[PDB]
Amino acid sequence: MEQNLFALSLDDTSSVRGSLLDTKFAQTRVLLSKAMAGGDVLLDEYLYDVVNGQDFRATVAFLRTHVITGKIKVTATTNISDNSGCCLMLAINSGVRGKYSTDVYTICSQDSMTWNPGCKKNFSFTFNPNPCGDSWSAEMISRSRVRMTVICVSGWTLSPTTDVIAKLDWSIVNEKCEPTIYHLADCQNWLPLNRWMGKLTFPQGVTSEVRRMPLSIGGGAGATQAFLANMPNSWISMWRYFRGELHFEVTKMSSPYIKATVTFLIAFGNLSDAFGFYESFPHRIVQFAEVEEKCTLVFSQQEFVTAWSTQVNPRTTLEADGCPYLYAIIHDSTTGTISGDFNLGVKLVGIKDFCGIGSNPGIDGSRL
Amino acid sequence: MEQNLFALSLDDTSSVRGSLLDTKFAQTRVLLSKAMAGGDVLLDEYLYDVVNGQDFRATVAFLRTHVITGKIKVTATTNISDNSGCCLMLAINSGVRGKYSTDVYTICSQDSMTWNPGCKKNFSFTFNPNPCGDSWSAEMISRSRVRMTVICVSGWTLSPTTDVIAKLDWSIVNEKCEPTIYHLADCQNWLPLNRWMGKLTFPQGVTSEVRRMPLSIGGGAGATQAFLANMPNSWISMWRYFRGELHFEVTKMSSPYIKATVTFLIAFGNLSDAFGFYESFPHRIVQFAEVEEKCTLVFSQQEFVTAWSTQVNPRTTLEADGCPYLYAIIHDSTTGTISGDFNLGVKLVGIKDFCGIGSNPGIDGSRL
Amino acid sequence: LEADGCPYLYAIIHDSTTGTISGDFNLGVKLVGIKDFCGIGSNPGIDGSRL
Amino acid sequence: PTTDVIAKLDWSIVNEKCEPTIYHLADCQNWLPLNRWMGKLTFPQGVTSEVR
Amino acid sequence: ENSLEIEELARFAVDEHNKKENALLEFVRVVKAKEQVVAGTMYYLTLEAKDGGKKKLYEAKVWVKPWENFKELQEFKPV
């Protein structure tokens, strides 16, 4: 029998939706070398080139659906014996410019998962590839040149026998795509940053190991006669002085076998190494279990008297630098049956109750 | 963040479902030659080979879904000027054997659409490729060798300027797959058949044109020193005598321009041509409009006194043959501005209130 | 395998077999039982094992 | 291991009812136990597409 | 039509054409592909390949028997 073809449901502009099987649209195969270093690009391709040569249930729906209101979930099913561990970081950035830096610092901003295969069997995270709207499409991200980058921030503490593979499973979940928009309001409730405060290596042994990371975060991170920049870190340097509850996220990057206990505290630069009374200050102890890999330090408003400067002159010494630092001090000693350093990654997630004062003319440099 | 991967919804055994866009799984391109004849295979391939080299929304879902409870809708969007017309027949059969017959008679049984592009803009029909169950799969029909066949039963009455194409759109709708199972109960409420009673050509002119089609349908249709067979027609010949309300479906195969009025009636073979009182019998007149193409004659139980035989000896003449015929008589004359015969296709759809008597030893032959 | 219309149970490595120590990733599958079992017909028999 | 190992089995008698497991020729059955060893699957260490 | 399979078949076309005719066409991409179920599958491909570093379009016909490792380039030509 005949029917009126104009009135059929062929102009169905639904988003992609269903179970996790029927929304999967690509799988990606990352090769982790037996002997990989820190700061080492494992994968680096455009997010649309992920879906080339694919034949999953939602692959054709993904390409052809004009609007998608759901987020992209990516899950990474990589594992390794507790004996070893490393730290991978997958990360999505809205674009590129020629001959780009792939230092962890540069990348992490915007949208990223960081995990240690040694501890976490798998790791998933959702994100919105259009950061200033509720929607996106396959055609948007192909032409916008959205860029996915997997990087190894810390090498294998004990190398596996053979090469490894990380399978990424790109799906579309059904959460609302909420936008992350930075703006120039002086008082903001939550200013996210995802600023890589730095990788902290502590060698195995007995010595007083102390690591300072300055909270004058603005004006990027260092290189040769050069400096690197995220957007959010460049954004916070718009203001001269600032303050707020700082929400760090400290992560283990070595294996579970390398054990160490770490005190974190706010304090000023003048304090030397071999000053044995760091626990006079208020502080937070961080022991990691075998399975735990991630821990969130928060430092309230009572840790800071006044606001402090976003940038400082590079040539100021630790002796005359009146902005606060975040100390990370080994409480006992770095130990283990196997050789390898106790790596530890600190990441300023965001500032709560942010208050930005003034208007930075700027400084030009990075570290303090 | 991590999640337990065993407990995700990746073992989703849902059927394919959604709009007609999201259930489309293949399109097929049939070429109709400018000068095509009757009994002419246009397309003939396995139903699973339809989906080879395809990239629609439900293509991968179709192949990979283990069970599908929905029917397959196929729609054919072929058209031509009212001036001309032909008769295509798409038809699905559960299998094959080497060097097979592709006569309309053989094919139509089971599941088929017949349409005239001249009248009907498009034509759709649903069907179940597993005829004895509620479900099927792509893997079932690939290995079962389900066979789709498009045939031209009547050529173009007036040829088009160029070659034509018929686009078939294979989808999966969400109707229940109901089985069609034949069985040996003597009284049945509805015995479907889809038996091709025959193509009736009436030339243009003035003469008394009369066409008899015997209702001793059993024992196939003729060939050389051979005969053809459907299953349902072989099934009805299991019984010796039978009766019931017969539901014919007479269809136009020529263009709308060739016009003719046709009386149908039940009567016995002895009645000659040039016997001018056919409308003494009870009868049914069939005029077709430009747009109408299909009309259903029903002949109640009051048209038949007793049951009649399913098969008759081939050598019985019309003079001594006591089973009823279905006459098709031109009421006026076959006319038109353009040359071409008035073709007309009769198809016994099924017998209602079927009553099968006895047990046929069999006869071996076809026509009477 | 090309012309065998019964189902298989596939077991596929999703990523890669790994470890600090050498040794294969052994894994033992055991069909415990069939629930809602439905047995049709009457096997004459075949004589052999694998397919 | 460094040395040989020993497994100590402790045979006791608990107080559960001894229920019988009897196979029979009913065509439809609710639970047909089998304990059929489908097979041991070795996957070597490495990167290749291993399918069993 | 699984685009991954077609990409591999298109590369096979350019590689077989190069072997057969002693050429050095550089494969760029597939543009068009038709699968037609036959005795096996027949593929009609339209693809871009660089001649002397110059992008050009070609038509290829490729016959595959999926039950064997049989792939055969039946014809290859510029459009």
Curated annotation (Swiss-Prot), chain D:
This is Large capsid protein. Not glycosylated. The record marks N15, W31 as: Interaction with the viral RNA. Contains a beta-sheet structure called beta-barrel jelly roll. It is found in: Virion. Interacts with the mature small capsid protein. Homomultimer; assembles as pentons. Interacts with the movement protein (via C-terminus). It comes from Cowpea mosaic virus (strain SB) (CPMV). Changing N15A: Loss of hability to cause a systemic infection in the host plant; no effect on encapsidation. It comes from the Viruses. Together with the mature small capsid protein, forms an icosahedral capsid (T=3) enclosing the viral positive strand RNA genome, with a diameter of approximately 300 Angstroms. The capsid is formed from 60 copies each of the large and the small capsid protein. The large capsid protein interacts with the viral RNA.
